[PDB]
Amino acid sequence: GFGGNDNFG
Amino acid sequence: GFGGNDNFG
Amino acid sequence: GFGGNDNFG
Amino acid sequence: GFGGNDNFG
Amino acid sequence: GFGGNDNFG
Amino acid sequence: GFGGNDNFG
Amino acid sequence: GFGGNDNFG
Amino acid sequence: GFGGNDNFG
Amino acid sequence: GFGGNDNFG
Amino acid sequence: GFGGNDNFG
Amino acid sequence: GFGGNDNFG
Amino acid sequence: GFGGNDNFG
Amino acid sequence: GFGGNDNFG
Amino acid sequence: GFGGNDNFG
Amino acid sequence: GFGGNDNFG
Amino acid sequence: GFGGNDNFG
């Protein structure tokens, strides 16, 4: 559960 | 690839 | 009373 | 992720 | 002769 | 019981 | 290498 | 967060 | 060399 | 990935 | 004499 | 196992 | 219990 | 062991 | 692992 | 140059 909005690219 | 934060046993 | 979230490998 | 004999990525 | 909850063995 | 070779998990 | 902005591998 | 003006070569 | 008979936990 | 003996500008 | 509700669980 | 009640001779 | 010689219960 | 003419009760 | 002429009982 | 009857696997 890596949770918070996480932009990846 | 990425986090496989599954609960395999 | 074994805890139902257990992974029993 | 999890692999077999060889796992990349 | 191992059991999950209890193993009268 | 008489646990024999358990090559297991 | 070389996909310009994000090369995963 | 690349800058989109540089000439990829 | 991981040749022989094994048991990946 | 294996970058490949591609010799390029 | 096992007077009460037993739980051999 | 449980020898239970031995009420005998 | 008894079991003669082998009472395993 | 045992193994003779015996009694019981 | 259990050997040769074994008397269980 | 590679080309050595390789087993990448």
Side-chain angles (χ1 to χ4, degrees), chain C:
Chain C
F2 217 39
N5 280 334
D6 56 346
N7 293 339
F8 177 47

Side-chain angles (χ1 to χ4, degrees), chain I residues 1-4 6-8:
Chain I
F2 202 74
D6 287 342
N7 200 32
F8 205 40

Side-chain angles (χ1 to χ4, degrees), chain L:
Chain L
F2 327 79
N5 292 342
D6 275 344
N7 298 341
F8 91 126

Side-chain angles (χ1 to χ4, degrees), chain D:
Chain D
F2 327 101
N5 186 340
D6 307 345
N7 182 32
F8 317 104

Side-chain angles (χ1 to χ4, degrees), chain N:
Chain N
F2 255 37
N5 45 353
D6 313 318
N7 268 324
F8 220 87

Side-chain angles (χ1 to χ4, degrees), chain H:
Chain H
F2 213 37
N5 295 337
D6 61 356
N7 298 339
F8 212 42

